[PDB]
Amino acid sequence: SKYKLIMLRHGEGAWNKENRFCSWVDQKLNSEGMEEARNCGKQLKALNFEFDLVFTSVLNRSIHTAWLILEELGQEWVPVESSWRLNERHYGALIGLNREQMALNHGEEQVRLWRRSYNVTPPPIEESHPYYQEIYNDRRYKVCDVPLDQLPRSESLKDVLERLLPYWNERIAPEVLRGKTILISAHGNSSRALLKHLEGISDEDIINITLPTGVPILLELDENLRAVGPHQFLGDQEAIQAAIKKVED
Amino acid sequence: SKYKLIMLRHGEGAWNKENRFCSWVDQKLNSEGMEEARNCGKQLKALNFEFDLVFTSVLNRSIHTAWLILEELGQEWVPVESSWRLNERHYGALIGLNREQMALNHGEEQVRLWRRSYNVTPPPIEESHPYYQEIYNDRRYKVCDVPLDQLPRSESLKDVLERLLPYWNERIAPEVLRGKTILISAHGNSSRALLKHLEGISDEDIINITLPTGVPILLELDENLRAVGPHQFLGDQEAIQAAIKKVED
């Protein structure tokens, strides 16, 4: 491959262990998520990765993950750019609800579509939603590349791809072609969406792919910034399977 | 004053307790310097500061200081940009020596000009100096706005102001004029050089000015971006006095 890139997702939190979606709620990493990020930095250091640029979302968990990684590398000086376009999927009205609640308010089949499918968009968060203000009153969203009301109120996996792709094409991709070594610190759905594009994964097959947290994902890209073969998980094979098991089902 | 600017310098380290100049050696904060950073964040929080942009040097101690502060504030999404032109003064051949070693190797009277004067430049580090390779083989200096070989090998306080000014004039000042609230996380000499410029402080007076560490320094600026009044230290007046005393001798 002409070019190589690293992407990863931060360790997940308390809500995830109670099968709740954090989505755009700006939850901090727990100590576990902190060790996970440090563990990546160490692994990447062991591989002598030398980054020239980092891209993160605007959610602090992804920014902290990047910072802990650069510290483990002694690369704190490497520029970091952050974008709402790398944000986790917006789960809309479903934000904050556990499995049982979603199922009761919407129906088990609806909810499975909303988590599982590629193109079906959850119902939008409304202003009555207990996390509407906590998201849209945040100064972060007043200085994006689109006005604050142009920002989504919910998203399918497809919708993720569609707002991420322009950031990839306009901001990240040119850096890759310039020969820079890029780290992307992102989230479950943003990472999945990006891979879908880079590997030309089908709408059908993207649903089933799993992405372990706190594992460097290596992409080797060709002239056209397409993956040469599948993505590769970097590090010890037994920590990788543990991590894959954690994101199963 | 139309505009407000915040600047601070990181907590000093063990070398500074030993009267050795860390300079361009990229030493980490010690536990003290970390706590100071956090405390400053808490102080900025109590005052309700909302930063739009953060500038640091390329030395990890200033970057870590900004990151600790943005964390305390919940403002990790705020863009960080770093530049060698905010770096601590380059003490050249004097890097790593204590005062006694300096005076033995250079003569005592000559040592006091290098330390205290506004415009006498220390002797340049050479490839024989034990810290040369650690500064000049570092990837970070290969991607500056000047080639590795145009980078200073030693500097007076005057030389620091003269390499800081183009960053001020071309990067920082235009954001201040846009109405952004800027945090500068810098070093003793880079903070002194900038304050001298904005306040119109004399070559004679600059030398005696007090710059405590871990304290927000507020400058209020008019339309020409000249200080209206003196800089003010923000926060608890008794910690400010603790801080002032620790820089004094």
UniProtKB/Swiss-Prot annotation, chains A, B:
Taxonomy of the source species: Eukaryota, Metazoa, Chordata, Craniata, Vertebrata
SMART domains per the UniProt record, alphabetical: PGAM (SM00855)
Keyword annotations: Acetylation, Congenital erythrocytosis, Disease variant, Glycation, Glycolysis, Glycoprotein, Hereditary hemolytic anemia, Hydrolase, Isomerase, Phosphoprotein
Family the entry assigns: Belongs to the phosphoglycerate mutase family. BPG-dependent PGAM subfamily.
Subunit: Homodimer.
Tissue specificity of this protein: Expressed in red blood cells. Expressed in non-erythroid cells of the placenta; present in the syncytiotrophoblast layer of the placental villi at the feto-maternal interface (at protein level).
Glycosylation, residue list: 2, 4, 17, 42, 158, 196
Clinical condition linked: Erythrocytosis, familial, 8: An autosomal recessive disorder characterized by elevated serum hemoglobin and hematocrit, and biphosphoglycerate mutase deficiency. ECYT8 affected individuals manifest hemolytic anemia and splenomegaly.
Key word Isomerase present: yes
Site feature: Transition state stabilizer: 187
Protein function: Plays a major role in regulating hemoglobin oxygen affinity by controlling the levels of its allosteric effector 2,3-bisphosphoglycerate (2,3-BPG). Also exhibits mutase (EC 5.4.2.11) activity.
Positions of the record's site feature: Not glycated: 28, 45, 142, 180, 245-246
One of the record's GO molecular function terms: phosphoglycerate mutase activity
Domain of life: Eukaryota
Activity modulation: At alkaline pH BPGM favors the synthase reaction; however, at lower pH the phosphatase reaction is dominant. Inhibited by citrate.
Entry annotated with the keyword Isomerase: yes
Modified residues (Phosphothreonine): 121
Protein name: Bisphosphoglycerate mutase
Originating species: Homo sapiens (Human)
